[PDB]
């Protein structure tokens, strides 16, 4: 079970046991929900939520794609997100805002079901004080499931239904013995991980992948800024699986994945076969940023206390 505790349900917090919805809810049958993934890190000044406004903006943007009406002002949701951290006494945690179409009707068209129901839940996130797993690097395997074309599913939004594609790819990767799946688009180019954006390094240059059919990662954005600030040249390109195979380094970014070095893809070692110095350095600075240790990046933090 998930230890969420107090959950914000359409305007008010209620015990986890009361945070339930009808099994006739539109989103439970047709994937018509939108959600976010936000992290709060402990800092010398207490818990700090990372790039809250950017995540809330994307939350409302995802809703717009489904023509879903969120009956709350962004300001209200932001306060609820801060409150879910405070009320539960969390420090390092994962926050999951969710807006879903309710049970007014079950016609596939979700418009009659507006406005959407909304909830905000959060749970503890274990801090990583080790290093072996990160330095060993993650092992990826290219999926047999292609990332949806931009006119099939809205890849720039975090729409519930979209994740069936991610789920299928993730299960496949894990079954094959890998840590994560690397999905290609229908044309055969690299797209993204089941829940992470991809980067690679070659001859001193950092290559971020184009947005193509992927989600515009906030971690990706953060990493690009950090890289440029450190003096690295950053280029945005479309990439093939074999460009990754021969890269000096490959790494993934995501709210949950932070900055994760990738040491092997399809059983082919990447560079030295372990995490490289560039990815490790970016992860290092990124973590200093999210924990309030970099004054230049304080603007990205929202302290709950």
């Amino acid at each position: 079970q998930i230890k969420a505790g107090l959950i914000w349900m359409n305007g008010a917090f209620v015990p986890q046991e009361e945070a339930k919805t009808s099994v006739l809810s539109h989103a439970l049958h047709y994937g018509t929900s939108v959600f976010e993934g936000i992290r709060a890190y402990e800092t010398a000044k207490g818990p700090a939520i990372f790039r809250l406004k950017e995540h809330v903006k994307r939350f409302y943007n995802s809703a717009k794609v489904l023509r879903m009406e969120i009956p709350f002002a962004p300001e209200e949701l932001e306060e609820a997100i801060k409150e879910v951290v405070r009320r539960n006494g969390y420090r390092s945690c994962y926050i999951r805002p969710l807006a879903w179409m309710g049970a007014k009707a079950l016609g596939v068209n979700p418009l009659p079901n507006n406005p959407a129901e909304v909830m905000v839940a959060a749970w503890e996130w274990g801090a990583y004080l080790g290093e072996e797993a990160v330095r060993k690097g993650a092992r990826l395997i290219t999926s047999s499931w292609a990332r949806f074309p931009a006119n099939v599913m809205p890849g720039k939004a975090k729409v519930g239904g979209n994740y069936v594609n991610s789920a299928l790819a993730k299960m496949e990767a894990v079954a094959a013995g890998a840590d994560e799946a690397l999905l290609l688009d229908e044309e055969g180019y690299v797209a993204e991980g089941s829940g992470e954006n991809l980067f690679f390094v070659r001859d001193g240059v950092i290559y971020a992948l184009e947005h193509s059919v992927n989600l515009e990662g906030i971690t990706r954005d953060s990493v690009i800024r950090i890289a440029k600030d450190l003096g690295y040249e950053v280029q945005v390109v479309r990439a093939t699986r074999d460009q990754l195979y021969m890269a000096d380094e490959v790494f993934m970014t995501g709210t949950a994945a932070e900055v994760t070095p990738v040491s092997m893809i399809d059983w082919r070692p990447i560079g030295k076969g372990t995490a490289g110095p560039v990815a490790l350095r970016l992860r290092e600075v990124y973590l200093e940023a999210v924990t309030g240790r970099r004054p230049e990046y304080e603007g990205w933090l929202t302290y709950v206390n």
Copy 2:
């Protein structure tokens, strides 16, 4: 609201108000659910469920695609479906079985969440039992490629594509959307399979990336039994534009004649004789008026 009444929840019936699940359920966040759409029609011998076993088979088949484990034997689900009709005193009704990944965890991988939670609900539908024909508009959303979303399964997440297409069609002033596949060929409606008639021949569309409709299957058998020649082909939007007739099939749509597509009239511009004839025989079959099709019916009483 939906007047479902008593809902079967993981082995037992409970009042609708109690049929709820955690908002932390995997399926509410990632579209990891599977469902079915089954009709029961009132007959002279009481309510009869149409092709129950075929629908239950597809339900379990959909679960397999997601590697979802349904903790009930097909026979148990069939009994539950018969009971949801009986216990609520329904005659004609729509039955909605649903299996979804619960709130054990929220990692995108659904395996840790097995087994799936299951429920069966039903509500009165088709209380009253077209000539103008439905108006369709081709969608700007393409039906998903076979390696993107499992189109042969009724997986919850798949319907985001159907939802986007349906909203677009309705907004454009049409009754339903006609989706093309990524290559540009006709696929299916947001929730119906397509057929067209030309020079006396009935053309059913290949399965391609569509759901293998049970109504489509029924219509093909009925057509052949009536003496019509039936061919299965891949089709383009303009093959439909010049067809003598076009019609859709689905559990909810039954057999629906299509009189216009993209503001271009199909044939006479109204429902044609072939679609109307197939519809009539189909309706006679589901209401227990055709001895030759009794095998497709499951009488609840």
Copy 3:
């Protein structure tokens, strides 16, 4: 120049010199026209138009794709087509009906230009192919089941390429890489005695193709309809094309690779000959396909 003679222009015949339209015509700028290709053959009973009905039906069907309004009843167009033959004293000829959007306005939307203008003109009447670098348009890009003027830019580009390469005709593939059709004809191939007609895919539903399939079945051949690749053609015993102008044309070579014996084969030659017998009124079984002008 083209020796057309008397041309039917929106209801009446006029000298060729008078059969003109404004250079501001929508169709001259945006390819918004539809047309047909119909043949008349000389028979023992005079000129006979081949499958006039199917061609006229397709003409109106093409117009519908463009939401183009033809201000004449099919029966009227059919009479005009018979008249262009006899008024010009033609026996064996090619007939070209054309409907185009006029010069009422030049916004890309052709609806304000309806109804379309119409005219009917006519004039007295193995192959080596090369696969084109131009793909036949996807079914959601251009209406391949219609003979819309703009569609033929794709055909023109392919034909020029083929001729420039030293071939007689171009073989176009669809965007996915499968064989589609020639720049103006449908394709068939023969393997181990079985005749394979290509599925309609993004191609025009040929009337000659339809005729050839019926004749082939009547002659006792097994006919299957399939999707084909260029190498299935390379390895075929025979390959042939069909079209109103091309009739049944054997294909002896594709991409400099000989097909079978490298010369016209028996099946294609036989189908071509029986087809000619049908269009010239020598086969009673196909009399229904002919419309005698006299």
Copy 4:
């Protein structure tokens, strides 16, 4: 009817009623024509044609795609374009040069019909923003129709999309390419703005717009960062602004796409600034952009 007046026909002006061509013309049957869209604006120094050079160059470039021979030197066509304005006493007008394959033969191969016939005609010529709807017709792949040229046949695709959009209640159609990415409008190039950055769509299968080119230069001169990218429909849905560019459309803000409001739901500040500088430029009020104008007087 179109009030064109005097039309330049293969070397000489003639009354509109005399500007006709055989119905057996190759282009009327197979879409084998090329054309341009050019505008003249009123200025304090008389009518000024906008970027005449670039339009004429593209006209000949389009002809090359069809291996069409234009029997006139670009300099001659330029003079004809200026004369069609003068002779008709136009000030603010739209100019439409057209080269088409004639009636020498009707085989699909246009080569035997060369050289092409040519004519030049012309006729006298926001806050709410335009509403677009994504089309069910995909923009042609680069190996299906020559999208970098204004070939007549190409516009059947544009016509189908425009009719669909209008029928759906929109002002213009937004076409995606076959892969599902945004391509262009039926006759306009697309841009979107997000967090202060202007995103111009890559050329992909689209026409290389001269208005698009002008807007990018203007944007950079105003200090805006401009990135050229591939875009999806939902990147547009989430943009702060979206706008279209074209000779006829000038710079047109887009307030809604697929019934989803863009940003505030009305024309945005960036699109409006670009539109204003563009209009100041074409009317001879920006010294730095005078090079783009050709004064007829």
Copy 5:
């Protein structure tokens, strides 16, 4: 090592040790070779080669795709194939004819290298079959029909098969299932696919696949047994929900598939239809089906 023994090299048999070619051979650098896979089975009347004629015809057909010239008449190659079995005293064996572009030049264009060099080599060939093979869908798509000639057994084509096979084995499967670029099922790395649903046998369309001779044989057998056979395009999930799935190929014969992507097919073991087809096929190749004797070429 491969125990081939005497190998036919451009018209004459030589010891395996002498069967070598220049490392500057065009085919070793650009994949410009064509080959076949043929089997001989022991029968009561001695070794019998299965559908030799069809295999040789495809060999020459593959060469035509590359505009490769084979400097021997089909009849000569057929005799060489019978002899490779005889001379080596083989009974049950796998035969591998190969035509490749030599070392006359290394420009990518192979025409200057004609005619091709040719050689023919061969080598000796219940619970597992009943258990069924396990497949995993590959992340490598079978090449489009305008990218590589899928109807021919061109050497270079197999880089795609090799990549897919390695991936499947690495994933713990027996074989790879490749989809085409559009997402539909194509074929295995070296075999054609079929599935069975509600008593009907579904053979996959040729699409971008090789026109298998085993596939052809199985369809004829199936029809002779009275099964309805439909040729269709198929998706991975149509296979997931099929009652049975099986592969065909010269080496694979008729191999039931009990699992795909860790999802059991039907009962999770070999099904009855695939097993019947396999039984009749094996009876046929071993000379125990008079009606199919036309498919056999007895070496003695």
Copy 6:
């Protein structure tokens, strides 16, 4: 026949006649080999191999794609490459390293055949412009064949396209990708020039050419603006210039594509200048590029 002379075979040089491999070698049946193309040019200080390290790095990179094991360290292969030039007394020559899967087994899976066998052989080694024709064979998608590697099997696609081009009367083939965009020549990368700007094509499904890389650096050093873009066939048709790059092709101007003249119809100034400066670089006349040269003496 090829006059290679002494060939390095798995650690030792042997006469050409002895450089043979079993006809049962996996690579001869399934295209499982990887190779490189390297050139040495005569300079004032003897033979100089151009960008040896980048070529060797790519050689090992190609091997990794096939999970092929090369039983020699890069330094050993580099020494062998220098020796193949020295031992044969070559000045200007083409060097061809090749690694292939041997005859241990013939199952399609090549892993059981590791490690690969390796050999290095070498042999002695515009104004009008090359004529290209667009191929009917598309360059393989990135998930069909590894286009960033020089894998033997990949070249069946190149071979088919080259034969087609030559048969059509052209010098080289221009392949498009499956989506219809320009990809690369059968063995060369493409560039085009328009309005003073040099456009290099994105990597897409193409090989990351070392000559392409060299030309881009040289162009920028000379003061040219260089942009990297996705291109269509008609963007090339309308370009002022088009040129190809490759180890064998060096910098080759393209004067015509699909019978449509590019610009003036003959080699243009930009391509000619880049070709000349490239030749100066590879022959040791530009100190700024000395780092790219490896002198064998």
